[PDB]
Amino acid sequence: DAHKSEVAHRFKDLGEENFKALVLIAFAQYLQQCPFEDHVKLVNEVTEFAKTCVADESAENCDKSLHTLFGDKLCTVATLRETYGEMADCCAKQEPERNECFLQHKDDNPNLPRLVRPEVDVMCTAFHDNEETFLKKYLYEIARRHPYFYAPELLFFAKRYKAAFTECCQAADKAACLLPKLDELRDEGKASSAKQRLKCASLQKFGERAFKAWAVARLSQRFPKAEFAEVSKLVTDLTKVHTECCHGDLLECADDRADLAKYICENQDSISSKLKECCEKPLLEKSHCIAEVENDEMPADLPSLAADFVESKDVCKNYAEAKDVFLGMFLYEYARRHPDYSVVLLLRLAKTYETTLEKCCAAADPHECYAKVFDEFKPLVEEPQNLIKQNCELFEQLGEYKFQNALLVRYTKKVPQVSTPTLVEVSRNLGKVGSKCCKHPEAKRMPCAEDYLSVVLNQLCVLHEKTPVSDRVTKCCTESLVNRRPCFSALEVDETYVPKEFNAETFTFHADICTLSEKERQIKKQTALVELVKHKPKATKEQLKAVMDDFAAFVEKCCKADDKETCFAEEGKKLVAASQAALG
Ligand SMILES: c1ccc(CN(Cc2ccccn2)Cc2cccc(-c3ccccn3)n2)nc1
Ligand SMILES: CCCCCCCCCCCCCCCC(=O)O
Ligand SMILES: CCCCCCCCCCCCCCCC(=O)O
Ligand SMILES: CCCCCCCCCCCCCCCC(=O)O
Ligand SMILES: CCCCCCCCCCCCCCCC(=O)O
Ligand SMILES: CCCCCCCCCCCCCCCC(=O)O
Ligand SMILES: CCCCCCCCCCCCCCCC(=O)O
Ligand SMILES: CCCCCCCCCCCCCCCC(=O)O
Ligand SMILES: [Cl-]
Ligand SMILES: [Cl-]
Ligand SMILES: [Cl-]
Ligand SMILES: [Cl-]
Ligand SMILES: [Cl-]
Ligand SMILES: [Cl-]
Ligand SMILES: [Cl-]
Ligand SMILES: [Cl-]
Ligand SMILES: [Cl-]
Ligand SMILES: [Cl-]
Ligand SMILES: [Cl-]
Ligand SMILES: [Cl-]
Ligand SMILES: [Cl-]
Ligand SMILES: [Cl-]
Ligand SMILES: [Cl-]
Ligand SMILES: [Cl-]
Ligand SMILES: [Fe+3]
Ligand SMILES: [Fe+3]
Ligand SMILES: [Fe+3]
Ligand SMILES: [Fe+3]
Ligand SMILES: [Fe+3]
Numbered sequence: 247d248a249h250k251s252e253v254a255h256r257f258k259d260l261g262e263e264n265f266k267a268l269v270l271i272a273f274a275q276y277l278q279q280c281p282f283e284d285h286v287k288l289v290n291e292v293t294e295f296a297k298t299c300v301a302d303e304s305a306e307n308c309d310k311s312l313h314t315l316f317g318d319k320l321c322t323v324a325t326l327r328e329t330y331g332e333m334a335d336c337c338a339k340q341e342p343e344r345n346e347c348f349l350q351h352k353d354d355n356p357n358l359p360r361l362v363r364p365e366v367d368v369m370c371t372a373f374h375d376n377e378e379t380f381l382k383k384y385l386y387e388i389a390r391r392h393p394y395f396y397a398p399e400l401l402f403f404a405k406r407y408k409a410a411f412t413e414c415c416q417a418a419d420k421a422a423c424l425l426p427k428l429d430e431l432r433d434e435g436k437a438s439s440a441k442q443r444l445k446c447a448s449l450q451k452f453g454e455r456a457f458k459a460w461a462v463a464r465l466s467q468r469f470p471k472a473e474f475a476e477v478s479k480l481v482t483d484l485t486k487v488h489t490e491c492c493h494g495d496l497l498e499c500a501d502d503r504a505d506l507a508k509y510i511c512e513n514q515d516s517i518s519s520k521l522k523e524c525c526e527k528p529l530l531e532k533s534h535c536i537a538e539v540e541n542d543e544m545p546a547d548l549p550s551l552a553a554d555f556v557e558s559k560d561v562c563k564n565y566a567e568a569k570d571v572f573l574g575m576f577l578y579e580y581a582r583r584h585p586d587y588s589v590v591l592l593l594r595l596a597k598t599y600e601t602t603l604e605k606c607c608a609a610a611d612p613h614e615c616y617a618k619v620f621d622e623f624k625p626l627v628e629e630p631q632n633l634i635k636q637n638c639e640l641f642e643q644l645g646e647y648k649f650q651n652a653l654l655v656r657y658t659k660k661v662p663q664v665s666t667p668t669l670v671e672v673s674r675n676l677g678k679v680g681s682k683c684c685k686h687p688e689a690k691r692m693p694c695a696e697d698y699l700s701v702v703l704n705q706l707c708v709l710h711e712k713t714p715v716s717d718r719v720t721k722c723c724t725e726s727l728v729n730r731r732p733c734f735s736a737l738e739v740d741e742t743y744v745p746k747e748f749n750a751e752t753f754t755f756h757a758d759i760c761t762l763s764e765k766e767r768q769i770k771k772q773t774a775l776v777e778l779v780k781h782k783p784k785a786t787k788e789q790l791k792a793v794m795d796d797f798a799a800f801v802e803k804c805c806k807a808d809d810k811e812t813c814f815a816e817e818g819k820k821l822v823a824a825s826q827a828a829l830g
Contacts, residue, residue, distance in 0.1 A: 249303075250303045250304065250308070250309055251299040251303035251304075251305075251308035251309060252310075252311055252312045252315075253295070253296045253299050253308060253312060253315060254296065254299040254300045254303050254308060256296075256312065257296045257297070257299070257300050258300060259529055260529075260530060262293070264401065264530060265293065265296065266289055266293055267382065267385060267401050267404065268397050268398065268401060269288075269289045269292050269293065270285055270286075270288075270289045270382060270385060270386060270389075271385060271389045271397040271400050271401065272316065272397055272496055273285050273288050273289065273319070273320075274385070274386045274389035274390050275352065275389050275390070275392075275393040275394075275395075275397070276320060276348060276352060276393070277320065277323060277326075277330070278353060278356050278358070278389075278390035278391075278393060279329055279330070279356070279390075280323065280325065280329065282383050282386050284323070285386055286382075288319060288323075291319075292315070292319060295307070295315075311341075312497055313341060313342070313345045313497060314341055316345070316497075317336075317337070317341065317344045317345055317348060320337070320348060321334075321337035330351070332351070333348065333351040335347075336348050336351065345495070349493075349494050349495060350494075352393045352394065352494065353393060354393065354394070356390070356391070356393075358390065358391055361384075361387055361388075361391075363428070366414075366420045366421040366424050366425065367420075369411070369415075369424070370411065370414075370415035370420055370424075373411045373415055374415070377408075380411075381404060381407070381408055381411075384404070384407070385400065385401075385404050388400065388403075388435075392439055394442065394443075394494060395438075395439055395442065396442065396491070396496075396499070397496055397500075398500065398530055398534065399438065399534070401530075402531075402534060403431060403434075403435050403438075406431055407428070407431065410423075410424060410427040410428065410431070411424070414427060433678070437698070437701050440701035440704060440705050441700075441701055443704070443708070444700060444701060444704040445488065445492070446488075446491075446492035447704075448460075448727065449488060449489065449492055452726065452727050454485065455570065456593075456726070456727055457485065457488075458481055458485060458574075459573075459574070459577060459593055459596065460589055460593065460727070461481045461484050461485070462477065462478070462481050462574050462577050462578060462581070463577055463578075463581045463589045463592045463593060463596075464581075464589050465477050465480055465481060465484075466577070466578040466579075466581035466582045467541050467581050467582065467584070467585040467587075467589075467693075468518065468539065468541050468542070468585075469517050469518040469541075469542055469582075470518075470541070470542055470543070470544040470545060470582035470583070470585075471518060471519065471542050471543070471544075471545055472516060472517050472518060472542075473516065474574070474575055474578050476513070476516050476517060477578055478571075478574065480510075480517075483506050483509070484506070486502060487499070487502045487503055487506055490502055491503070503533045504529055504532070504533065506533065507524075507525075507529070507532040507533040507536055508532075510525075510536055511524075511525035511532065511536075518539070518542035519542055519543075520539050520540050520541070520542045521536065521539060523535065524536045524539060541585045544582055544583060544585075545582075548582075548583055551576075551579050551580060551583075551620075552620060554575075554579070555576055555579075555599070555620075556613070556616065556617060556619065556620060557613070559613065561603075561607075561612075561613075562603070562606070562607035562612050565603050565607060566607060569600075573596050573599070573600050576596050576599050577592060577593075577595075577596040580592055580595060580596070585689075585690075585693070586688070586689040586690065586691075586692060586693070587627070587692055587693070588630065588692045588693055588695065588696035589693075589696060590696060590727060590728055590730075590731065591626065591627065591630060591692065593727065593728050594626050594728050595623050595626060595627075597728060598619070598622055598623060598626065599619060602615075602616050602619040602622065603616065606619075629732070629735075630692055630695070630731075631688070631691075631692065633735060634683075634691050634692060634695060635688075637680060637684075638680060638683075638684035638691070640652060640680075641677075641680040641681070641684050642684065646677050646678070646680075646681050647677070647768060649677050649680060650673050650674055650676070650677035650772070651673075651772065651775060651794075653673040653676050653677060654669060654670070654673045654772055654775050654776055654779070655775070655779055655787075655790065657669060657672070657673060658776050658779040658780060658783075659739045659740070659779060659783060660737045660738065660739060660740065661715075661716050661718065661719060661737065661740065662740050662743040662746075662779075662780055662783060663715040663716050663740070663743070664715050664716065664719075665713070665715070666773055666776045666777060666780070667773070668709065669776050670769060670772045670773055670776060672702065672706055673772070674772070675702050676702060678698075679695065679698040679699060679702065682694060682698060683695050683698065696731075699731065703730060703731065703734065706719075706723075707719075707722075707723035710723055711723070718737055719737075721733060722734050722737070739783075740783075743783055745780070745781055745782070745783055746777070746780040746781045747781075748781050748826070749777075750822065752774065752777050753774060753777070753778070753822050753825075754814075754815070754818060754819075754822070755770075755800075755801070755814050755818055756811070756814060756815075757810045757811040757814060759801060759805070759814075760801075760805045760810060771797075775794070778790075778793065778825075782829040782830070785829045789828060789829055792828055793825045793828060793829070796821055796824065796825070797821060797825075800817055800818060800821045803817060804817050804818070
């Protein structure tokens with residue numbers, strides 16, 4: 247029906263190197279606790295066998311589906327019963343139940359130590375002696391910690407990491423080049439892991455119609471020179487894709503992804519003209535590239551949306567004829583015109599239209615009833631543009647670090663009850679969001695913000711369901727996609743909070759504060775700022791500036807000083823004592 251040998255088709259399709267790396271990521275995600283060692287033979291054997299099928303597709307065993315091959319290898323591991331336990335009982339089953347059985351014993355978050363990043367001298371020296379082992383061991387370590395991370399995407403990050411190593415490992419200050427590049431693409435790797443978990447939960451926590459409206463909006467921004475009927479074809483295929491990808495089967499998700507890229511690339515002309523570099527790329531990178539394509543230009547003279555949606559007499563019956571399709575046509579016309587909008591803003595608008603149409607298409611004079619609906623959109627539009635305008639001018643006046651401290655005070659007062667490391671991690675993340683996004687002009691600021699906020703805001707919510715501390719954070723995390731952010735933006739100062747018991751040790755500073763990296767230094771300052779607010783919640787902004795002003799003096803005096811360890815302990819007891827009286 248399909249190819250005679252699946253393994254051969256994919257070996258020639260991918261190439262040996264991509265095949266080897268991808269086979270290893272798959273077994274790494276399924277047998278996370280086995281030594282690096284075991285996987286390298288497993289991949290070698292899988293790769294020896296695949297080559298025999300490239301030579302002869304009618305050779306031994308080459309006609310079994312890759313799924314069969316995959317489980318067959320998993321069950322040859324002899325430690326499977328002792329190390330994986332009930333995961334070995336899946337071998338008692340036959341296909342297709344066996345694969346579906348291995349599928350649900352993938353361990354979302356297993357118990358592995360956090361990888362400690364060795365020094366730049368020792369990384370570069372290791373990358374030289376054995377490039378292969380260095381890069382593949384780290385692929386194994388990351389895949390065993392991220393079992394649901396799409397394998398092709400993990401391979402793309404590994405190739406970027408390799409690029410950093412090949413370039414920065416032959417420089418004068420290797421660390422000056424390597425470290426920012428590993429921080430950038432580790433935060434990127436953490437941000438992409440979060441997008442993947444968010445979308446899958448979004449699928450089911452808000453509904454398919456909410457999801458389907460999301461993708462209608464997004465696809466209309468990306469492809470404005472395309473018909474609503476092409477867009478809604480693509481929305482439907484994409485929902486199939488995401489549904490089997492979130493389910494977890496790598497092969498099933500990758501086939502579905504490739505077929506969609508092949509379709510998109512055949513029907514380029516009716517879709518978008520920004521699409522020729524991705525379609526000349528190999529099968530593996532095709533959908534990767536199409537996923538990240540720039541928005542096509544909007545058709546030049548587009549009419550006002552008020553004809554089809556306000557002034558036409560037929561709106562109320564075209565709507566009631568097929569309510570959702572009409573709302574999706576509203577959504578597509580509004581979106582193709584506004585790639586400067588966040589998707590969720592466009593969903594607020596379509597939902598506001600919708601709420602106005604059920605009210606107004608019951609009236610006698612509906613056109614009279616809804617002639618101010620388009621007026622209604624504009625404060626919805628104004629709200630996020632303005633808190634962006636406001637927060638990017640703050641960032642511009644304070645620089646990243648001082649802006650992050652502004653946010654620390656803001657969110658500690660809003661939600662005092664949160665752990666102080668978490669307050670620091672999130673206010674540090676938001677400041678990086680402002681650094682990334684405020685470098686766009688206004689026309690691209692709102693998509694940027696939603697792109698990064700939605701992962702920060704979801705990582706915050708998965709953390710909260712685990713260790714709950716605030717009902718007002720539970721509220722916002724359980725609301726509709728469209729109300730998630732405006733809920734957070736509406737959190738006010740907890741005026742029911744009781745100040746924290748003052749603890750002396752938490753505001754004393756030893757001699758290490760000088761000998762620390764620029765990062766760690768800031769972290770310990772920010773940790774104390776939080777605990778200062780947690781103890782002085784009704785401190786004013788000016789009082790706080792005095793307390794942090796005198797503190798900053800206190801470090802610069804007892805760090806240029808010939809005796810460090812004793813100016814800190816004495817000029818600090820005075821600071822703690824002066825601060826307690828300045829506040830209160
Ligand atoms: C890792 C992380 C993020 C991305 C997203 N990519 C979109 C893109 C646009 C055109 C062609 C391929 N990828 C942007 C980008 C930046 C740097 C490298 C690559 C890349 C290189 C090879 C394969 C896949 N990606 N990609 N890719 C890999
Ligand atoms: C702590 C950083 C260690 C150095 C990086 C190792 C370079 C090769 C790694 C291959 C796969 C990398 C995928 C990382 C994604 C993530 O950070 O979640
Ligand atoms: C024992 C064999 C198991 C491994 C089988 C090889 C499968 C390689 C991974 C398939 C994805 C390749 C195409 C990517 C699809 C896409 O996202 O465009
Ligand atoms: C990783 C995105 C899905 C897989 C790629 C299949 C073909 C490209 C799809 C382009 C859609 C661009 C918008 C982002 C996807 C979304 O709406 O969630
Ligand atoms: C066939 C495409 C579907 C189009 C549906 C358009 C509906 C517009 C209303 C916006 C809904 C987004 C918010 C979801 C709220 C919810 O379902 O709880
Ligand atoms: C400008 C980004 C960094 C700012 C850090 C804290 C303030 C975040 C609020 C700004 C963006 C809000 C709009 C997001 C998308 C939407 O809800 O439509
Ligand atoms: C478990 C973690 C709890 C963290 C909750 C504290 C709130 C931190 C800030 C998140 C809201 C940011 C989005 C809107 C920005 C704004 O208007 O301030
Ligand atoms: C009740 C008061 C207790 C004593 C408080 C002592 C001072 C704590 C200061 C911690 C905030 C650090 C501010 C960093 C700003 C900067 O780097 O200039
Ligand atoms: Cl093919
Ligand atoms: Cl060399
Ligand atoms: Cl050499
Ligand atoms: Cl990092
Ligand atoms: Cl996650
Ligand atoms: Cl999403
Ligand atoms: Cl699989
Ligand atoms: Cl490229
Ligand atoms: Cl009229
Ligand atoms: Cl219609
Ligand atoms: Cl407009
Ligand atoms: Cl625009
Ligand atoms: Cl009118
Ligand atoms: Cl917490
Ligand atoms: Cl602006
Ligand atoms: Cl977070
Ligand atoms: Fe060499
Ligand atoms: Fe890429
Ligand atoms: Fe009129
Ligand atoms: Fe959001
Ligand atoms: Fe001490």
